[PDB]
Amino acid sequence: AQKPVDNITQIIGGTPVVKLRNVVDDNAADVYVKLEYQNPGGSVKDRIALAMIEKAEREGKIKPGDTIVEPTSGNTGIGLAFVCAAKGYKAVFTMPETMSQERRNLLKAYGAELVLTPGSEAMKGAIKKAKELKEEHGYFEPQQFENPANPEVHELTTGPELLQQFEGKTIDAFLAGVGTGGTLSGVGKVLKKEYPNIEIVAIEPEASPVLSGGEPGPHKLQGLGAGFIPGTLNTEIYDSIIKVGNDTAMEMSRRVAKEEGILAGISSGAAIYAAIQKAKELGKGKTVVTVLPSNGERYLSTPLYS
Amino acid sequence: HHHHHMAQKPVDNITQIIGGTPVVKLRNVVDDNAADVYVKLEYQNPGGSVKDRIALAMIEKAEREGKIKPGDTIVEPTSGNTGIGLAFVCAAKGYKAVFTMPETMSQERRNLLKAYGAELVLTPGSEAMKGAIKKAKELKEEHGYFEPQQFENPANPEVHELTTGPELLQQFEGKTIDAFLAGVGTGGTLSGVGKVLKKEYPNIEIVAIEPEASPVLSGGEPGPHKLQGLGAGFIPGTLNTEIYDSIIKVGNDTAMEMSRRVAKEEGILAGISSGAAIYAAIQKAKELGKGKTVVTVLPSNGERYLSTPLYS
């Protein structure tokens, strides 16, 4: 048990890794999952929310008391609301008025202010309002899809944690779903330098296979498939891409919760499904690692666990 | 190499992550001329609450004793965090779980338990908990299912004696804990932690927290209340009725307002029982003054209660 800390953000990072036991055939490679939902705010986005705020502090772009704006209502918005509450910043989030009441409460619970944009304008309307607050009112915009602090914090923390966790053991493949791409790009850079023969695998939705050259489309892999190539994604870092369908990822999330006792979101089900293909392709004795970005309890209002 | 927090090497299954929960000093909701207030984040258990500890301990002892073996079915009449912890542990260890509850339990909660593969047996909502308890016993007698019994199983207070307590006691080595406060549901946390802290800190004050609207420890009548996880309506067998030196009653609105203050001002988003424990801990922190040290436990996370009035 860790000694007392003065601030909850000091708990961000140092997440555990669990070997999968039942959803992987014993003929395949070992599969390990990093539980990023063990971050105190509930997801991997804790890490970039802290890094984005810390970097802006260092560079004098913000000081505690200042106001932040980001066009998101997902895990990055929760992470920013959490980090801003913990560090004394005011968080403003723009989102379409169609966003759920449960998610609005969670953001408002941390003291964040919500700016609702026209529902038909969807995400594009939220981005426009955020650009207006940044350019015409001086709000600081973290910009999760372009801020280099995003892939860099995974280069400095998530990746080296995996290196410590797999000391003396070789990792044969690392797989991660691509949202902003910061996880895959930053962990990938660190693992490839330490394990030059590792395979880095990007995971993306079958229904929106933008990295594979296909067309953006609606999909149910929440957290994945942004519909474009993020500035935070190093497209050179991955050797291959695995596409996962909506139903396939949901089925595996249900399997992992019931047979491993690990309750994670649909993007984690996609990651574990892809990690299990790679394991079977690599065979016994090899080592496959992936990341579980979020907890299944955040998605009880979705068809994931209905 | 050197820019990351230390991370534990891989474990063979998720139950090995239970325990070892961190402690955070409160900064803003507590005056500096009051005693320091420290909170142990039991919602950092992998299943989301303090109940992971007793779910694992109860199942593991039943194995050690030979009462159950993997593949067997567990039955428990509950819908709260104990059911979640038990569903979580049963999935992790290869047990079947059957829970009874009144049909007025929320749908999101039904999905949570079912996500782990537990069965939900619904009883007439007008028979309330008595109906869920009766159905559990009928199934227990009919099929020989093991019943953990969260309010009677000695493994419940014992695991807090063997893990939660020694954790704090190594988390506070070289410091004096002046008061330890804990809300009483089963009473296992207060009983087990209190026993261990008392042995190390002879002058420590052990405080039970219960709802003002159902103060059964104080000798009042059990009544409806809003402090989820607290106020069982009876004195549980797992509560050591001699461990606590004093009792603090907390009202419904008081705990809710503290939970919202802590979420906005500390960035710590916890359930309503945590707001009650923090309110009582600050009250205790005010009377005994600067320099002293009060410690309490936050049993669950605020995200579990988004559909309740706590955060609407």
Coordinates of C-alpha atoms in Angstrom, one line a residue:
Chain A
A1 CA 0.0 0.0 0.0
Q2 CA 1.2 3.5 -1.0
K3 CA 1.9 6.1 1.6
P4 CA -0.6 9.0 1.7
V5 CA -0.5 11.5 -1.1
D6 CA -1.6 15.1 -0.9
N7 CA -3.5 15.1 -4.2
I8 CA -5.6 12.4 -6.1
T9 CA -3.7 13.0 -9.3
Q10 CA -0.6 11.4 -7.7
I11 CA -2.6 8.1 -8.0
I12 CA -2.7 8.4 -11.8
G13 CA -0.5 5.7 -13.4
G14 CA 1.1 2.6 -12.1
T15 CA -1.7 0.4 -13.3
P16 CA -1.7 -3.4 -12.9
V17 CA -1.4 -6.2 -15.5
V18 CA -3.4 -9.4 -15.4
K19 CA -2.7 -12.7 -17.4
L20 CA -5.8 -14.0 -19.2
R21 CA -6.7 -17.5 -18.2
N22 CA -9.9 -18.8 -19.8
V23 CA -10.7 -16.8 -23.0
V24 CA -7.3 -17.8 -24.5
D25 CA -6.6 -21.3 -25.7
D26 CA -3.7 -22.9 -24.0
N27 CA -2.3 -23.6 -27.4
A28 CA -1.8 -19.9 -28.1
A29 CA 0.6 -17.3 -26.7
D30 CA 0.1 -15.8 -23.3
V31 CA -2.1 -12.7 -23.2
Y32 CA -1.7 -9.9 -20.7
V33 CA -4.0 -6.9 -20.2
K34 CA -3.1 -3.6 -18.6
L35 CA -6.0 -2.2 -16.5
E36 CA -6.0 1.5 -17.4
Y37 CA -9.5 1.8 -15.8
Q38 CA -7.6 1.4 -12.5
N39 CA -6.6 5.1 -12.8
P40 CA -8.5 7.1 -10.2
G41 CA -10.7 8.8 -12.8
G42 CA -11.7 5.5 -14.4
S43 CA -9.8 5.4 -17.7
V44 CA -6.6 5.8 -19.6
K45 CA -7.6 9.4 -20.3
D46 CA -6.5 10.3 -16.8
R47 CA -3.0 10.2 -18.0
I48 CA -3.3 12.6 -20.9
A49 CA -5.7 14.9 -19.0
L50 CA -2.9 15.4 -16.4
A51 CA -0.1 15.6 -18.9
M52 CA -2.0 18.2 -21.0
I53 CA -2.7 20.4 -18.0
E54 CA 0.8 20.0 -16.6
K55 CA 2.5 20.9 -19.9
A56 CA 0.3 24.0 -20.2
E57 CA 1.3 25.0 -16.7
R58 CA 5.0 24.5 -17.3
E59 CA 4.8 26.7 -20.5
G60 CA 2.8 29.4 -18.7
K61 CA -0.2 29.0 -20.9
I62 CA -2.5 28.5 -17.9
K63 CA -2.3 28.9 -14.1
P64 CA -4.6 27.5 -11.5
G65 CA -7.9 29.4 -11.6
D66 CA -7.8 29.5 -15.4
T67 CA -10.5 28.1 -17.6
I68 CA -10.1 25.1 -20.0
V69 CA -12.3 24.2 -23.0
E70 CA -12.4 20.9 -24.9
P71 CA -15.1 19.6 -27.4
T72 CA -15.7 16.2 -25.8
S73 CA -18.1 14.3 -23.6
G74 CA -16.3 10.9 -23.5
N75 CA -13.5 9.7 -21.3
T76 CA -11.2 12.6 -22.1
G77 CA -13.8 15.0 -20.8
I78 CA -14.2 13.0 -17.6
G79 CA -10.4 12.9 -17.2
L80 CA -10.1 16.7 -17.7
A81 CA -13.0 17.4 -15.3
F82 CA -11.4 15.1 -12.7
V83 CA -7.9 16.6 -13.2
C84 CA -9.2 20.2 -13.3
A85 CA -11.2 19.7 -10.1
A86 CA -8.1 18.1 -8.4
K87 CA -5.7 20.8 -9.6
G88 CA -7.9 23.9 -9.2
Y89 CA -8.9 24.6 -12.8
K90 CA -12.2 25.5 -14.3
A91 CA -13.3 23.0 -17.1
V92 CA -15.8 23.9 -19.8
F93 CA -16.9 21.2 -22.3
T94 CA -18.9 21.7 -25.5
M95 CA -21.1 18.9 -26.7
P96 CA -24.3 18.4 -28.6
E97 CA -27.5 18.8 -26.6
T98 CA -28.3 15.1 -27.4
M99 CA -25.6 13.9 -24.9
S100 CA -27.0 11.7 -22.0
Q101 CA -28.1 13.1 -18.7
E102 CA -25.9 10.6 -16.8
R103 CA -22.8 11.8 -18.6
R104 CA -23.7 15.4 -18.0
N105 CA -24.1 14.7 -14.3
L106 CA -20.7 13.0 -14.1
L107 CA -19.0 16.0 -15.7
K108 CA -21.0 18.5 -13.5
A109 CA -20.2 16.4 -10.4
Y110 CA -16.5 17.5 -10.9
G111 CA -17.6 21.2 -11.1
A112 CA -17.3 21.4 -14.9
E113 CA -19.5 23.8 -16.9
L114 CA -21.3 22.4 -20.0
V115 CA -21.9 24.4 -23.2
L116 CA -24.5 22.6 -25.3
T117 CA -24.4 22.9 -29.0
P118 CA -27.2 22.2 -31.6
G119 CA -28.0 18.5 -31.7
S120 CA -28.1 18.3 -35.5
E121 CA -24.7 19.9 -35.8
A122 CA -23.3 16.9 -33.7
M123 CA -19.6 16.9 -33.0
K124 CA -18.8 19.6 -35.6
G125 CA -21.0 22.0 -33.7
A126 CA -19.1 21.3 -30.5
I127 CA -15.7 21.8 -32.1
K128 CA -16.8 25.2 -33.6
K129 CA -18.0 26.5 -30.3
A130 CA -14.7 25.4 -28.7
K131 CA -12.7 27.2 -31.4
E132 CA -14.8 30.3 -30.7
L133 CA -14.0 30.2 -26.9
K134 CA -10.3 29.6 -27.7
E135 CA -9.9 32.2 -30.3
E136 CA -12.3 34.9 -29.2
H137 CA -12.2 34.4 -25.4
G138 CA -8.8 33.1 -24.6
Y139 CA -9.8 29.7 -23.2
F140 CA -7.1 27.1 -23.2
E141 CA -7.9 24.2 -25.6
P142 CA -5.9 21.0 -24.7
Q143 CA -6.7 19.4 -28.2
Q144 CA -6.5 15.7 -27.4
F145 CA -6.1 14.8 -31.1
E146 CA -3.1 17.1 -31.7
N147 CA -1.3 17.8 -28.4
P148 CA 2.1 16.1 -28.4
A149 CA 1.8 15.8 -24.6
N150 CA -0.7 13.0 -25.3
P151 CA 1.6 10.4 -27.0
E152 CA 4.5 11.7 -24.9
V153 CA 2.9 10.8 -21.5
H154 CA 2.5 7.3 -22.8
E155 CA 6.2 7.4 -23.8
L156 CA 7.1 8.5 -20.3
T157 CA 4.7 6.5 -18.1
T158 CA 2.5 3.8 -19.7
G159 CA 5.3 2.4 -21.8
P160 CA 8.0 2.3 -19.2
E161 CA 5.5 0.8 -16.7
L162 CA 5.1 -2.1 -19.1
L163 CA 8.9 -2.4 -19.4
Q164 CA 9.2 -2.7 -15.6
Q165 CA 6.2 -5.1 -15.5
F166 CA 7.8 -7.3 -18.2
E167 CA 11.4 -7.1 -17.1
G168 CA 13.4 -10.1 -18.4
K169 CA 10.4 -11.3 -20.3
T170 CA 10.2 -10.4 -24.0
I171 CA 6.9 -9.0 -25.4
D172 CA 6.3 -10.4 -28.9
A173 CA 3.3 -8.2 -29.8
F174 CA 1.7 -5.1 -28.4
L175 CA -1.9 -4.2 -29.5
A176 CA -3.9 -1.2 -28.8
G177 CA -7.1 0.3 -30.0
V178 CA -6.6 3.7 -31.7
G179 CA -8.7 6.6 -30.4
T180 CA -6.3 9.6 -30.4
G181 CA -3.5 7.0 -31.1
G182 CA -1.5 8.4 -28.2
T183 CA -1.4 5.1 -26.4
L184 CA -0.3 3.0 -29.4
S185 CA 2.1 5.6 -30.6
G186 CA 3.8 6.3 -27.2
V187 CA 3.8 2.8 -25.8
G188 CA 4.8 1.5 -29.2
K189 CA 7.8 3.8 -29.5
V190 CA 9.1 2.7 -26.1
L191 CA 8.4 -1.1 -26.6
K192 CA 10.0 -1.1 -30.1
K193 CA 13.2 0.5 -28.8
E194 CA 13.4 -2.1 -26.0
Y195 CA 12.0 -5.0 -28.1
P196 CA 13.2 -4.4 -31.7
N197 CA 11.4 -7.6 -32.9
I198 CA 8.0 -6.7 -31.3
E199 CA 5.0 -6.4 -33.6
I200 CA 2.9 -3.3 -32.9
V201 CA -0.7 -3.7 -34.0
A202 CA -3.3 -1.0 -34.4
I203 CA -6.9 -1.9 -33.6
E204 CA -9.8 -0.1 -35.3
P205 CA -13.5 -0.7 -36.0
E206 CA -14.5 -2.9 -38.9
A207 CA -17.3 -0.4 -39.6
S208 CA -14.9 2.6 -39.8
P209 CA -11.6 1.2 -41.0
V210 CA -9.9 4.6 -41.7
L211 CA -6.4 3.4 -40.9
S212 CA -6.9 0.4 -43.3
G213 CA -7.8 2.8 -46.1
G214 CA -11.6 2.3 -45.8
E215 CA -14.3 4.8 -45.3
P216 CA -15.3 6.4 -42.0
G217 CA -18.6 5.1 -40.8
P218 CA -20.8 4.9 -37.7
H219 CA -19.7 2.2 -35.3
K220 CA -20.3 1.0 -31.7
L221 CA -16.6 0.8 -30.6
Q222 CA -16.9 3.7 -28.1
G223 CA -13.5 5.4 -27.7
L224 CA -12.2 4.1 -31.1
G225 CA -12.6 5.1 -34.7
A226 CA -12.4 8.8 -34.7
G227 CA -13.1 8.9 -38.4
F228 CA -9.8 10.4 -39.4
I229 CA -6.0 10.1 -38.8
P230 CA -5.3 12.0 -35.6
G231 CA -2.3 14.2 -35.4
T232 CA -1.4 12.3 -32.2
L233 CA -1.1 9.0 -34.1
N234 CA 2.3 8.0 -35.4
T235 CA 1.2 6.1 -38.5
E236 CA 4.7 4.5 -38.8
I237 CA 4.5 2.9 -35.4
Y238 CA 2.3 -0.1 -36.2
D239 CA 3.3 -3.0 -38.4
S240 CA -0.3 -4.2 -39.0
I241 CA -3.9 -3.4 -38.3
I242 CA -6.7 -5.6 -36.9
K243 CA -10.3 -4.7 -37.6
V244 CA -13.0 -5.7 -35.2
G245 CA -16.7 -5.8 -35.8
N246 CA -19.3 -4.3 -33.4
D247 CA -20.8 -7.6 -32.4
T248 CA -17.4 -9.3 -32.1
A249 CA -16.1 -6.8 -29.6
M250 CA -19.3 -6.8 -27.6
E251 CA -19.2 -10.7 -27.4
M252 CA -15.6 -10.7 -26.2
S253 CA -16.3 -8.1 -23.5
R254 CA -19.1 -10.3 -22.3
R255 CA -16.8 -13.3 -22.4
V256 CA -14.0 -11.6 -20.5
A257 CA -16.3 -10.3 -17.8
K258 CA -17.9 -13.7 -17.2
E259 CA -14.9 -16.0 -17.6
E260 CA -12.0 -13.8 -16.3
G261 CA -13.9 -11.5 -13.9
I262 CA -12.7 -8.5 -15.8
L263 CA -15.5 -6.0 -16.5
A264 CA -14.2 -3.6 -19.3
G265 CA -15.7 -1.4 -22.0
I266 CA -16.4 -2.4 -25.6
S267 CA -13.0 -1.0 -26.8
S268 CA -11.3 -3.4 -24.4
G269 CA -13.3 -6.3 -25.8
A270 CA -12.0 -5.3 -29.2
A271 CA -8.5 -5.1 -27.9
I272 CA -8.7 -8.6 -26.3
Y273 CA -10.3 -10.1 -29.4
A274 CA -7.5 -8.8 -31.5
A275 CA -4.9 -9.9 -28.9
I276 CA -6.4 -13.4 -29.0
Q277 CA -6.1 -13.7 -32.8
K278 CA -2.5 -12.5 -32.6
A279 CA -1.8 -15.0 -29.7
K280 CA -3.1 -17.9 -31.8
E281 CA -1.1 -16.8 -34.8
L282 CA 2.1 -16.5 -32.6
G283 CA 1.6 -19.8 -30.8
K284 CA 2.6 -21.1 -27.4
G285 CA 5.4 -19.6 -25.3
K286 CA 5.1 -16.1 -26.9
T287 CA 3.8 -13.0 -25.1
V288 CA 1.0 -10.6 -26.2
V289 CA 0.1 -7.5 -24.3
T290 CA -2.8 -5.0 -24.8
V291 CA -4.5 -2.2 -22.8
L292 CA -8.0 -2.0 -21.4
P293 CA -8.9 1.7 -21.6
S294 CA -12.1 1.8 -19.6
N295 CA -14.4 0.0 -17.1
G296 CA -17.5 -1.8 -18.2
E297 CA -19.5 0.0 -15.5
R298 CA -19.2 3.2 -17.5
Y299 CA -21.3 1.6 -20.3
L300 CA -24.3 0.1 -18.4
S301 CA -26.6 2.3 -20.4
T302 CA -25.5 0.9 -23.7
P303 CA -26.3 -2.5 -25.4
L304 CA -22.9 -3.8 -24.2
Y305 CA -24.4 -5.4 -21.1
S306 CA -28.1 -5.4 -21.7
Chain B
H1 CA 13.6 4.1 -17.1
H2 CA 12.9 6.7 -14.5
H3 CA 9.8 8.8 -15.3
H4 CA 7.0 6.5 -14.3
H5 CA 5.3 5.3 -11.1
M6 CA 6.2 1.8 -10.0
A7 CA 3.9 -0.8 -11.4
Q8 CA 3.2 -4.2 -10.0
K9 CA 4.3 -7.2 -12.1
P10 CA 1.6 -9.3 -13.8
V11 CA -0.9 -11.2 -11.7
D12 CA -2.5 -14.5 -12.6
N13 CA -6.0 -13.3 -11.9
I14 CA -7.9 -10.1 -11.1
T15 CA -8.6 -11.0 -7.4
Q16 CA -4.9 -10.6 -6.6
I17 CA -5.4 -6.9 -7.2
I18 CA -7.9 -6.6 -4.3
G19 CA -6.4 -4.7 -1.4
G20 CA -3.5 -2.3 -1.2
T21 CA -5.7 0.8 -1.6
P22 CA -4.2 4.3 -1.5
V23 CA -4.8 7.2 1.0
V24 CA -5.3 10.8 0.1
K25 CA -5.0 13.9 2.4
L26 CA -7.9 16.3 2.1
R27 CA -6.8 19.9 1.2
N28 CA -9.8 22.2 0.7
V29 CA -12.9 20.9 2.5
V30 CA -10.8 20.8 5.7
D31 CA -9.5 23.9 7.6
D32 CA -5.8 24.0 8.4
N33 CA -6.6 24.8 12.0
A34 CA -8.4 21.5 12.2
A35 CA -6.8 18.0 12.3
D36 CA -5.5 16.5 9.1
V37 CA -8.1 14.2 7.4
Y38 CA -7.0 11.2 5.4
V39 CA -9.3 9.0 3.3
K40 CA -8.5 5.5 2.2
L41 CA -9.9 4.9 -1.3
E42 CA -11.5 1.5 -1.1
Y43 CA -13.3 2.2 -4.4
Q44 CA -9.8 1.5 -6.0
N45 CA -10.4 -2.2 -5.4
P46 CA -10.8 -3.7 -8.9
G47 CA -14.5 -4.4 -8.4
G48 CA -15.2 -0.8 -7.3
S49 CA -15.8 -1.0 -3.6
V50 CA -14.6 -2.2 -0.2
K51 CA -16.8 -5.2 -0.6
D52 CA -14.3 -6.9 -2.9
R53 CA -12.3 -7.6 0.2
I54 CA -15.1 -9.6 2.0
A55 CA -16.3 -11.2 -1.2
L56 CA -12.9 -12.7 -1.7
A57 CA -12.3 -13.6 1.9
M58 CA -15.6 -15.3 2.3
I59 CA -15.2 -17.4 -0.9
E60 CA -11.6 -18.2 -0.1
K61 CA -12.3 -19.4 3.4
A62 CA -15.2 -21.6 2.1
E63 CA -12.6 -23.2 -0.2
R64 CA -10.0 -23.5 2.5
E65 CA -12.6 -25.2 4.7
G66 CA -13.9 -27.4 1.8
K67 CA -17.5 -26.1 1.9
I68 CA -17.2 -25.1 -1.8
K69 CA -15.1 -26.0 -4.9
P70 CA -14.9 -24.1 -8.2
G71 CA -18.0 -24.8 -10.2
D72 CA -20.3 -24.6 -7.1
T73 CA -23.1 -22.1 -6.8
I74 CA -23.2 -19.2 -4.3
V75 CA -26.5 -17.6 -3.1
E76 CA -26.8 -14.3 -1.3
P77 CA -29.8 -12.0 -0.7
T78 CA -28.5 -8.6 -1.7
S79 CA -28.4 -6.0 -4.5
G80 CA -25.7 -3.6 -3.4
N81 CA -21.9 -3.6 -3.4
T82 CA -21.7 -7.0 -1.7
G83 CA -23.6 -8.5 -4.6
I84 CA -21.3 -6.7 -7.1
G85 CA -18.2 -7.9 -5.2
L86 CA -19.5 -11.5 -5.0
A87 CA -20.5 -11.5 -8.7
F88 CA -17.0 -10.1 -9.5
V89 CA -15.2 -12.7 -7.3
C90 CA -17.3 -15.6 -8.5
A91 CA -16.6 -14.8 -12.1
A92 CA -12.9 -14.4 -11.3
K93 CA -12.6 -17.7 -9.5
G94 CA -15.1 -19.9 -11.4
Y95 CA -18.1 -19.9 -9.2
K96 CA -21.8 -19.6 -10.1
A97 CA -23.6 -16.7 -8.3
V98 CA -27.4 -16.4 -7.6
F99 CA -28.7 -13.2 -5.9
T100 CA -32.2 -12.6 -4.7
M101 CA -33.6 -9.1 -4.5
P102 CA -36.9 -7.2 -4.7
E103 CA -37.8 -6.4 -8.3
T104 CA -37.5 -2.6 -7.6
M105 CA -33.7 -2.8 -8.0
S106 CA -32.5 -0.5 -10.7
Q107 CA -32.0 -1.8 -14.2
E108 CA -28.4 -0.6 -14.5
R109 CA -27.6 -2.6 -11.4
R110 CA -29.3 -5.7 -12.8
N111 CA -27.1 -5.3 -15.9
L112 CA -23.9 -4.9 -13.8
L113 CA -24.6 -8.2 -11.8
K114 CA -25.5 -9.9 -15.0
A115 CA -22.4 -8.7 -16.8
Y116 CA -20.4 -10.9 -14.4
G117 CA -22.7 -13.8 -15.2
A118 CA -24.7 -13.8 -12.0
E119 CA -28.4 -14.9 -12.0
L120 CA -31.0 -12.5 -10.5
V121 CA -34.0 -14.0 -8.8
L122 CA -36.6 -11.4 -8.3
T123 CA -39.0 -11.4 -5.3
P124 CA -42.3 -9.5 -4.8
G125 CA -41.3 -5.9 -4.4
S126 CA -43.8 -5.6 -1.6
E127 CA -42.1 -8.3 0.5
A128 CA -38.9 -6.1 0.3
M129 CA -35.7 -7.6 1.9
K130 CA -37.5 -10.1 4.0
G131 CA -38.9 -11.7 0.8
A132 CA -35.4 -11.8 -0.8
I133 CA -33.9 -13.3 2.3
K134 CA -36.7 -16.0 2.4
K135 CA -36.2 -16.9 -1.2
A136 CA -32.4 -17.2 -0.7
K137 CA -33.0 -19.7 2.2
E138 CA -35.4 -21.8 0.2
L139 CA -32.8 -22.1 -2.6
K140 CA -30.1 -22.7 -0.1
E141 CA -32.1 -25.6 1.5
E142 CA -33.3 -27.0 -1.8
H143 CA -30.0 -27.1 -3.7
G144 CA -27.4 -27.0 -1.0
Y145 CA -26.0 -23.7 -2.3
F146 CA -23.4 -22.0 0.0
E147 CA -24.6 -18.7 1.4
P148 CA -21.7 -16.3 2.3
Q149 CA -23.9 -14.3 4.8
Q150 CA -22.3 -10.9 4.7
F151 CA -23.8 -9.9 8.1
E152 CA -22.8 -13.0 10.0
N153 CA -19.7 -14.5 8.4
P154 CA -16.6 -13.9 10.6
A155 CA -14.4 -13.9 7.6
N156 CA -15.8 -10.4 6.9
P157 CA -14.4 -8.6 10.0
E158 CA -11.3 -10.9 9.9
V159 CA -10.2 -9.8 6.4
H160 CA -10.2 -6.2 7.5
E161 CA -8.1 -7.3 10.5
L162 CA -5.6 -9.1 8.2
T163 CA -5.5 -6.7 5.2
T164 CA -7.2 -3.3 5.5
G165 CA -6.0 -2.6 9.0
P166 CA -2.3 -3.6 8.6
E167 CA -2.4 -1.6 5.3
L168 CA -3.3 1.6 7.2
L169 CA -0.9 0.8 9.9
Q170 CA 2.0 0.5 7.4
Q171 CA 0.6 3.5 5.5
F172 CA 0.8 5.5 8.8
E173 CA 4.0 4.1 10.2
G174 CA 5.8 6.8 12.2
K175 CA 2.5 8.8 12.6
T176 CA -0.1 8.7 15.3
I177 CA -3.7 8.1 14.2
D178 CA -5.9 10.0 16.7
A179 CA -9.3 8.9 15.4
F180 CA -10.6 6.3 13.0
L181 CA -14.1 6.6 11.7
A182 CA -16.1 4.3 9.5
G183 CA -19.7 3.9 8.4
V184 CA -21.3 0.7 9.5
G185 CA -23.0 -1.5 7.0
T186 CA -22.0 -5.0 8.1
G187 CA -19.6 -3.4 10.6
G188 CA -16.7 -5.5 9.3
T189 CA -14.5 -2.6 8.3
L190 CA -14.9 -0.8 11.6
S191 CA -14.5 -4.0 13.6
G192 CA -11.4 -5.4 11.9
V193 CA -9.6 -2.1 11.3
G194 CA -10.5 -0.8 14.7
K195 CA -9.1 -3.9 16.5
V196 CA -5.8 -3.5 14.6
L197 CA -5.4 0.2 15.1
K198 CA -6.4 0.0 18.7
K199 CA -3.6 -2.5 19.4
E200 CA -1.0 -0.1 17.9
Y201 CA -2.5 3.2 19.0
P202 CA -3.8 2.8 22.6
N203 CA -5.3 6.3 22.9
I204 CA -7.1 6.1 19.5
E205 CA -10.8 6.9 19.3
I206 CA -12.9 4.5 17.2
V207 CA -16.1 6.1 15.9
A208 CA -19.0 4.3 14.3
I209 CA -21.0 6.3 11.7
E210 CA -24.7 5.6 11.1
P211 CA -27.6 7.4 9.5
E212 CA -29.6 9.9 11.6
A213 CA -32.7 8.5 10.0
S214 CA -32.0 4.9 11.1
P215 CA -29.8 5.0 14.3
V216 CA -30.1 1.4 15.4
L217 CA -26.7 1.3 17.1
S218 CA -27.8 4.3 19.2
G219 CA -31.0 2.4 20.1
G220 CA -33.4 4.1 17.7
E221 CA -35.8 2.5 15.4
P222 CA -34.7 1.3 11.9
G223 CA -36.2 3.6 9.3
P224 CA -35.8 4.4 5.6
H225 CA -32.7 6.5 4.8
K226 CA -30.5 7.5 1.8
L227 CA -27.0 6.6 3.0
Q228 CA -26.6 3.6 0.6
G229 CA -24.4 0.9 2.1
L230 CA -25.1 2.1 5.7
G231 CA -27.9 1.6 8.2
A232 CA -28.7 -2.1 7.7
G233 CA -31.7 -1.6 10.0
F234 CA -30.3 -4.1 12.6
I235 CA -27.1 -4.7 14.5
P236 CA -25.2 -7.2 12.3
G237 CA -23.5 -10.2 13.8
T238 CA -20.3 -9.1 12.0
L239 CA -20.2 -5.8 13.9
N240 CA -18.2 -6.0 17.2
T241 CA -20.5 -4.0 19.4
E242 CA -17.6 -3.2 21.8
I243 CA -15.1 -1.9 19.3
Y244 CA -16.4 1.7 18.9
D245 CA -15.9 4.4 21.6
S246 CA -18.6 6.6 20.2
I247 CA -21.2 7.1 17.4
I248 CA -21.8 9.9 15.0
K249 CA -25.2 10.2 13.3
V250 CA -25.3 11.8 9.8
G251 CA -28.3 13.1 8.0
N252 CA -29.3 12.4 4.4
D253 CA -28.8 15.9 3.0
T254 CA -25.6 16.4 5.0
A255 CA -23.8 13.4 3.5
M256 CA -25.0 14.3 0.0
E257 CA -23.7 17.9 0.3
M258 CA -20.3 16.7 1.5
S259 CA -20.0 14.2 -1.4
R260 CA -20.6 17.1 -3.8
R261 CA -18.1 19.3 -2.0
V262 CA -15.4 16.7 -2.1
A263 CA -16.0 15.9 -5.8
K264 CA -15.7 19.5 -6.8
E265 CA -13.0 20.7 -4.3
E266 CA -10.8 17.6 -3.9
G267 CA -11.4 15.9 -7.2
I268 CA -12.5 12.8 -5.3
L269 CA -15.8 11.5 -6.6
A270 CA -17.3 9.0 -4.1
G271 CA -20.6 7.6 -3.0
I272 CA -22.9 9.1 -0.4
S273 CA -21.6 6.8 2.4
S274 CA -18.2 8.4 1.8
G275 CA -19.7 11.9 2.1
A276 CA -21.1 10.8 5.5
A277 CA -17.8 9.4 6.6
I278 CA -16.0 12.5 5.5
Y279 CA -18.5 14.8 7.2
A280 CA -18.2 12.9 10.4
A281 CA -14.4 12.9 10.0
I282 CA -14.2 16.7 9.6
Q283 CA -16.5 17.1 12.6
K284 CA -14.1 14.9 14.6
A285 CA -11.2 16.9 13.0
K286 CA -12.7 20.2 14.3
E287 CA -13.0 19.3 17.9
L288 CA -9.5 17.9 18.4
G289 CA -7.6 20.5 16.5
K290 CA -4.5 21.2 14.4
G291 CA -1.8 18.6 14.5
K292 CA -4.0 15.5 15.1
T293 CA -4.7 12.9 12.5
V294 CA -8.1 11.4 11.6
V295 CA -8.5 8.6 9.1
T296 CA -11.6 7.2 7.4
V297 CA -12.6 4.9 4.6
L298 CA -14.4 5.8 1.3
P299 CA -16.3 2.6 0.4
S300 CA -17.5 3.2 -3.1
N301 CA -17.2 5.5 -6.2
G302 CA -19.6 8.3 -7.1
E303 CA -19.9 7.0 -10.6
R304 CA -21.9 4.0 -9.3
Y305 CA -24.7 6.4 -8.2
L306 CA -25.2 8.6 -11.2
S307 CA -28.9 7.6 -11.4
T308 CA -29.5 8.6 -7.8
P309 CA -30.2 12.2 -6.5
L310 CA -26.6 12.3 -5.2
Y311 CA -25.3 13.8 -8.5
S312 CA -28.4 15.1 -10.4

